[PDB]
Amino acid sequence: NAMKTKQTDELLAKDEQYVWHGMRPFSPNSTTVGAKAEGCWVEDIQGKRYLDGMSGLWCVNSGYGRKELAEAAYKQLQTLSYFPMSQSHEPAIKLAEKLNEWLGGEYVIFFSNSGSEANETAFKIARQYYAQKGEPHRYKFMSRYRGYHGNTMATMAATGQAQRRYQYEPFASGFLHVTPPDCYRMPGIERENIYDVECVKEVDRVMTWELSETIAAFIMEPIITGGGILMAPQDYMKAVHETCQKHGALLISDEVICGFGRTGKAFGFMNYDVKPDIITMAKGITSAYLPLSATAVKREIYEAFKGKGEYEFFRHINTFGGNPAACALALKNLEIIENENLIERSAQMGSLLLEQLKEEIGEHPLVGDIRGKGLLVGIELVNDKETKEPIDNDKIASVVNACKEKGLIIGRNGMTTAGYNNILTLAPPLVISSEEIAFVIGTLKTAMERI
Amino acid sequence: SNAMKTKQTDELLAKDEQYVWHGMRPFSPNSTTVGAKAEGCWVEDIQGKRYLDGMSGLWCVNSGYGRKELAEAAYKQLQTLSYFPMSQSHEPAIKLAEKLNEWLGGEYVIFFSNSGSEANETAFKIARQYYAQKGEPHRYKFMSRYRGYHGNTMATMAATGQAQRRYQYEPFASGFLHVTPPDCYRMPGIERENIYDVECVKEVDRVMTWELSETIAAFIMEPIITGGGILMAPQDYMKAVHETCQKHGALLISDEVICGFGRTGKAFGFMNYDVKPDIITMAKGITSAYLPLSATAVKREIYEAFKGKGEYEFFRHINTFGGNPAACALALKNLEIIENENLIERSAQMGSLLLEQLKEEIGEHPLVGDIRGKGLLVGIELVNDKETKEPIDNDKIASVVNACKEKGLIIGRNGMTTAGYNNILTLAPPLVISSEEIAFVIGTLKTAMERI
Amino acid sequence: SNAMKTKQTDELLAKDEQYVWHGMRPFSPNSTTVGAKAEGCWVEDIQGKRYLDGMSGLWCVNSGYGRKELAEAAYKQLQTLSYFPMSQSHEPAIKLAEKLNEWLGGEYVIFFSNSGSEANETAFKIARQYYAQKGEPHRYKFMSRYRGYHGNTMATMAATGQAQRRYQYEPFASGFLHVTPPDCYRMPGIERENIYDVECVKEVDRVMTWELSETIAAFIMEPIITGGGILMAPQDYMKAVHETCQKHGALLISDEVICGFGRTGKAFGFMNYDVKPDIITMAKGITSAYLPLSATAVKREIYEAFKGKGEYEFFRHINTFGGNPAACALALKNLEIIENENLIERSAQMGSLLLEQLKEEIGEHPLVGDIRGKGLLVGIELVNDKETKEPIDNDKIASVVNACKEKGLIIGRNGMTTAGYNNILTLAPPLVISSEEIAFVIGTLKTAMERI
Amino acid sequence: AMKTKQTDELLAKDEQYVWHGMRPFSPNSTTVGAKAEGCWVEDIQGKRYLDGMSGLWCVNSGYGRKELAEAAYKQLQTLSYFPMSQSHEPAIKLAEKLNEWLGGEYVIFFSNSGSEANETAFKIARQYYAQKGEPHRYKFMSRYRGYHGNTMATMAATGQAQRRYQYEPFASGFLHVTPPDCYRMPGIERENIYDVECVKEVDRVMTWELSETIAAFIMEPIITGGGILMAPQDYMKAVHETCQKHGALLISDEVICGFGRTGKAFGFMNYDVKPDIITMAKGITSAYLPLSATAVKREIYEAFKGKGEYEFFRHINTFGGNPAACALALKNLEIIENENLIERSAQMGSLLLEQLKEEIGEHPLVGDIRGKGLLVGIELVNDKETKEPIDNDKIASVVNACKEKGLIIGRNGMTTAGYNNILTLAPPLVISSEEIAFVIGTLKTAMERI
């Protein structure tokens, strides 16, 4: 209830006239213009407040209104605004060292701005690495259907969500896909000996059938998040890594969403006992206060780029990547996550959120499955629990809308896989409290009563 | 003390060698320069050496270093709202989009991205989807010039005409075509001819006809090919290319990543050439590179095609960080600075002075083939022979770049663009550069030229 | 003429080595066999050695060698009209098209090509143009099975799932997808499951969903994967795949290049499996390989889409030699032979006898993993271990192939199809083969098996 | 002979069952060939036509050759099939004979069609480099307005968009350059070849794409189907020298120009070059039976002789090198040689060219008349000054008028949009002076319409 009422009309009119909004139907009258935020709550220009159950876009991990983060950026901006990453600056050096600690070592870090750029960089490094190790023929990249890895032509090629690809094709050749592990739609795969699991055998078979010698890397999120919070058997990622190694290919762990405490570990891959050859990161690295991403590469791979030959080094320049202010802010963000025990709070609040959700709506006739790890949770809505038929779009959409009216931002896997945008997503900021979790669940439960 | 400074430097260099992967350079850990601080046109490393940055970082620190008002703008926004998804909106993005539309001359709708490469990728996707929704799904092809650069991603590398930026990252997608670049130095007299009799202008029309008009989505070009060597076209070239695009039903995308925001002596490069582009891409100088931000400006009529109620009719593209609140608020202040300090006109005037003085000072040098530029954007083409125009040996131009750096000038070079044509020195100093600093640039270069 | 004949053969072999490039083999001039003459199921080389041809040349001499009536048919036509372009027509092409339509069961329109690879290429182009003219230009994708083969050209190799036929000829075009091949030996009990619960059947539907139905033009498959290893599917597999194509709006192409013309005990392989394919491709046995000819049969509803007055509406494709008059006239006589000598039914009955006798004869051999087939089309899968099904060592299966040839039997092998899986012996004898010649085949193989 | 009722039935069967290449669905317009002799063909209704196109640039020795029929028949009675993984005597003898014809020293891979022959050349080029330490060389370069086949890869290499449209997308790695055309680029034939812009373009594009990524440049010596587009004399040699400079191969597409068509055994022989790879089809058998060949320099073949798993050419073409077609081809080459057909092509071709200029050269819509050997293009224009291609109906009416009057003349239809304006003649090499008079007389009268 602001003392002076903000002038919305001009701002709203200007947005509609000049701003192109990603991922949505033209509905200017539905635009939410964010004004301010604190903790887990955001507020629009009209003054309405919402619990942000999505951390913006899976990314505001340390929460909103962090004065410490603002100061870190401010101090750096006053010292040195820019230095090219062909050369170096102290914030980038300190962050690279810090990321190496977080990763468990030993990696060399190339800085980029976005998760899409980080994945593109991983592809180029993989190809040049093999060209310089006497295996020029290895160019192929393999991923899972229903996955996402970016918004560029090559990361869309690697993406398995056709609703993100359609009408932007044709793409380059050399991108292959396999069935995604999903313990809900493939019941009992979790029980099986991992190497008897069909979608695990598929990885090995396709690599054999494509010829090992042509495969550069397998890319995967530890959990398929955007796609629907699809989860694999415990030994899946390790089996995939052993398969890559068998065929001489690299494993790239896409940690763009799972990174920085999201799943209850520093990174998603750490749930699954693997050391990936390349790790890509963005989003939570700065809690999205400033743009920054990174591609961490095993050091043996970096060694291949040290020669005196004309084309032996990485011939790639990213103007803004590794921005000084973003790096300084990221260092402070990592210190916050560590000092406030946000990784373990994610694990614990995540369990509570999962346990409570099942208790509150699990019996609902259109709730097919509730699953998650850390503060990363999917509620799969179905027309029928027996057949697992995805719920009608109209029904899930009305639940997301109802929650917003009531002050809760909840996500949905819209525009990922046709006929399967049936999944509600929660990824709240890691600082979320037990009481705010009660608000989330209470709000959702009430919204569920409309279907 | 120096001894302490030496120790800190070593510790830092050691950490860098161990942990940091540097773009665009041979692995030379000892040679690395760690930036420490900066003010105006000068940067300083951790050991305390100062350099005139004749490159504005990477063609991008247009308003100069040390801008406290830019730091304040970002800080004030970070304290108000640090993040909001661009699927939704926030005031800094809205105000910047409106401001950019003024700068562009209207009427455009702006999609925000982090980098120039992302901005170009966005342009490609918008061009393809626009045609798909206008009844022409078959239009997928993108056309650009050899010796051009448009980004570091698979698709922007496919559109790129610098093979040294592409080699060993192929194969790329099909549907990317290239034509001869206009270069008034290596194609003497093209500037004089009627534009439509110019062979590389006829090439654009011919190739569109021979590929079938109906398959061409867009032609992408920088108004000046900058990274490639500051290659410059006849005055009427860009307008003839636009008219040719329109004839074939294709869009023209002006890549303003480097030429934007006063660099050429106009707000944008295309404004030198009397054309209104369908799409404009921007990055770099938009924030003077203090924070990452880029934009893809699209004509209103193209945007209208994405307003339908159909399932796939909207732009199904999400960029997490693009349009960052702090970067937008900082960009707004940056544009205010450029306007209030008359930096666009200073670029034009200091640019002329730099060009005229360079010619007087080193024009007669036997290995200087050509000096050209527009605004604070200048290339000095070095040759073994002025008659044949044979590019100078790599060692010779490299020694000049290194000699300047020792003498405290950072000058650029078109390294790793086109094989055997790495022979062009580049200057793009910050638009605040003074007459006296220009004298330092030229004096230092002149002295470094004496070693070859 | 003891040394005169030797001089002649030596000379011929020397000229082969210097001038002839052979398909699909390591350079082995001594190894080369020069065919001289043939009759029935037996071929004879220039040195005078005779062999039972257990492979019908290359799966193709279905009616057997030495057919004077086929020679006469070609000769009579060469004397009447040697050539006429298929943009226009000739009577042999018209009569053959009509006869192929009967054999197919109607109602199809036939486009003539020389090879199976060309026939499949033609099918791809027709599928794409069909959808472009049906208001779905976005449909470009082609789907097939890993371990499958569809030709030796860039696009048919892209559709091919045998990497040893592809390696070092890449990169290929995008838009070619592959799924797991049904193989009732390595996936035991899929033949007794409900077809829609079979994982590699569900895979077809899932991948079409995940790629977006609207982008899929066609699924291409042989009814039995022949060159690959005689891999066989559950009875209802092909019908399920067709229903899945129809569900997604895509076409089904039956690759009948090897299975066609009696090979499997039906006129065509798809007829074992109760489907009416949208497109059928044929070559090989159509002329018993006496002359080159192939065909792409397309459903009439599909051909209707190419009858418009629009500029690009017709099939803009010309194949100079395809539908050669002599080859068509010979093919007609060949079809008449197959029908009059009841070669289809004979293939089915002789094929059963061959399969059962092989099981009785070498079934218990410790390295014989599986014996399977349908009609005169049989695979013997050799393994190091019957429990693990590990493919046998290459040197071991190679020695069996060589031992057989030395004793006058040509037996095939799935060499250079799938790495690590080159372990399957293949028999496809001419459909005229007799009980007694089958005894010779099996007896010779049994004796060759002894040595491993 | 065949009563109207029976011909109607045959025509009806064609409509129902036969899919024709390269034409609008016009069942009534279909010509069903019945028989032929020399340069004349006859349809089922009994009408006769001078075939000014040799079928499709291919019936080089003429129709009605009993000796060719006998050669095929004799072989079909001896051995009808043997796999080219192995060998037969007709293939061996032909390979040797083709090597003589080419000038040596080449190794021959047999295919059926020109499209397959070109595909084979692409695969060999790529594997050759992969085995020579340059796996990065995968690109193929060709000219816009050129044609190399009807398959996805040969269409990618093709520069005629009307043969490509709606069959796309194609694979990446196919590049195109401006075609030399001495009519639309006047005075390039007088320039020093290396100052010619479309010659410089080859060198520049190879540099700009990076030499190390280029596998081969493919080109017809004369762009025939595209509209008989002809280059300066030193163009092909300059292109070869440029390929060599960049470490790339030159493939001469001789599918149409081969076997006497241009007045030499092969087109490249007009231009003083020895190509790395030569592809052939059409006239090799005079189109009596299907056969094509890919001739590869000996030194390229040497790279495929190793003991490594993947070192040999892993390519099988079932029908390629058919015994009857090879035996017939051998007799066809003996005929061309014995009857002095290559020389006749040059002589009759010169005659045809000069008489045409005299008869129709002054026609206001005839922009240019050009050719070499029995390969001639007459470019029709709305205006001789601007060279604007003639209206489409106008050239179509001339083609139709000629057929009505018993002459089959060709046209470059469905090649380059807006540029379908060139009439083509490629008559059988045995054509006589008197038949040439008939051709020209018939065309002259047809031109009267427009």
Ligand SMILES: [Cl-]
């Ligand atoms: Cl600064």
Ligand SMILES: [Cl-]
């Ligand atoms: Cl994934």
Ligand SMILES: [Cl-]
């Ligand atoms: Cl905030």
Ligand SMILES: [Cl-]
């Ligand atoms: Cl450009």
Ligand SMILES: [Cl-]
């Ligand atoms: Cl198959």
Ligand SMILES: [Cl-]
């Ligand atoms: Cl004839």
Ligand SMILES: [Cl-]
């Ligand atoms: Cl025979």
Ligand SMILES: [Cl-]
């Ligand atoms: Cl050509």
